[PDB]
Design a protein around this ligand. Structure first.
Ligand SMILES: CCCCNC(=O)c1cc(S(N)(=O)=O)c(Cl)cc1SC1CCCCC1
Ligand SMILES: [Zn+2]
Length: 257
């Protein structure tokens, strides 16, 4: 099955998932000089006041913090989007070292990690239908750099010991994802894809310019997770990122400057 190594990593995905070589794959390098400022783009509206986290899951590729998406409670709107997108889950991608880990890059700079808040377009009724549509998902991507701790991240970090291995989950209620956001909502946006199999070309990407800072101790806790299940040989969950893919016939737009 697919994963992050030499024989099952990103360079192999196209044999099971030929869209890997498609026209709107993610992530991409964000060449900041070439991105054009679009005065028609709106401020992003992030409305997370009523978010209901329920659980956290080690799915063997990353960990997902899941939300109750059965009512409009945590929604993304505005920005480049038409209509309303409901938060279903967030997860991260991170490196074995602080110098790598992000999926998107900014003028070829790789951040230590990248947070993905995944939302689906309510006009398609549920996530599984949304991923079959070119405007089905909106993913808010946020870079992480290592420096000062992110206090709003600590509840996540502290539960990771309980979900060390693939298939473990834990009650994870009352987590507020507002504590993972940077000060500015200035962003870049482009049409792309899921960055994991099945690599569906269903995502409007919204990548924030301002990274959040997390501490070395926080990211070290990410790197103690395992991609294996309990009772199997230990493979640290590190370097769970797909490299930048060809931009092809796409324009990256900036909400700023
Ligand atoms: C089997 C799932 C493997 C791990 N991937 C994800 O959790 C995932 C990653 C992204 S990303 N990295 O582009 O933000 C997005 Cl947008 C949606 C999904 S969940 C979804 C994938 C399609 C159908 C299965 C669940
Ligand atoms: Zn992701």
């Amino acid at each position: 099955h697919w994963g992050y190594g030499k024989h099952n990593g990103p360079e192999h995905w196209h044999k099971d998932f030929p869209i890997a070589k498609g026209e709107r794959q993610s992530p991409v390098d964000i060449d900041t000089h070439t991105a054009k400022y679009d005065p028609s783009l709106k401020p992003l509206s992030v409305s997370y006041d009523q978010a209901t986290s329920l659980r956290i899951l080690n799915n063997g590729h990353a960990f997902n913090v899941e939300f109750d998406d059965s009512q409009d409670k945590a929604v993304l709107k505005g920005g480049p989007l038409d209509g309303t997108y409901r938060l279903i889950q967030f997860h991260f991608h991170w490196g074995s070292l602080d110098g790598q880990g992000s999926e998107h890059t900014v003028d070829k700079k790789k951040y230590a990690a990248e947070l993905h808040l995944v939302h689906w377009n309510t006009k398609y009724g549920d996530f599984g239908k949304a991923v079959q549509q070119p405007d089905g998902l909106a993913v808010l991507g946020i870079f992480l750099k290592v420096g000062s701790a992110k206090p709003g991240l600590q509840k996540v970090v502290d539960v990771l010991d309980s979900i060390k291995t693939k298939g473990k989950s834990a009650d994870f209620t009352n987590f507020d994802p507002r504590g993972l956001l940077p000060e500015s909502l200035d962003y870049w946006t482009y049409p792309g894809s899921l960055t994991t199999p099945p690599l569906l070309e269903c995502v409007t990407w919204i990548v924030l310019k301002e990274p959040i800072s997390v501490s070395s101790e926080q990211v070290l806790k990410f790197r103690k997770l395992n991609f294996n299940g309990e009772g199997e040989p230990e493979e640290l969950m590190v370097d769970n990122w797909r490299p930048a893919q060809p931009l092809k016939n796409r324009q990256i737009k900036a909400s700023f400057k």
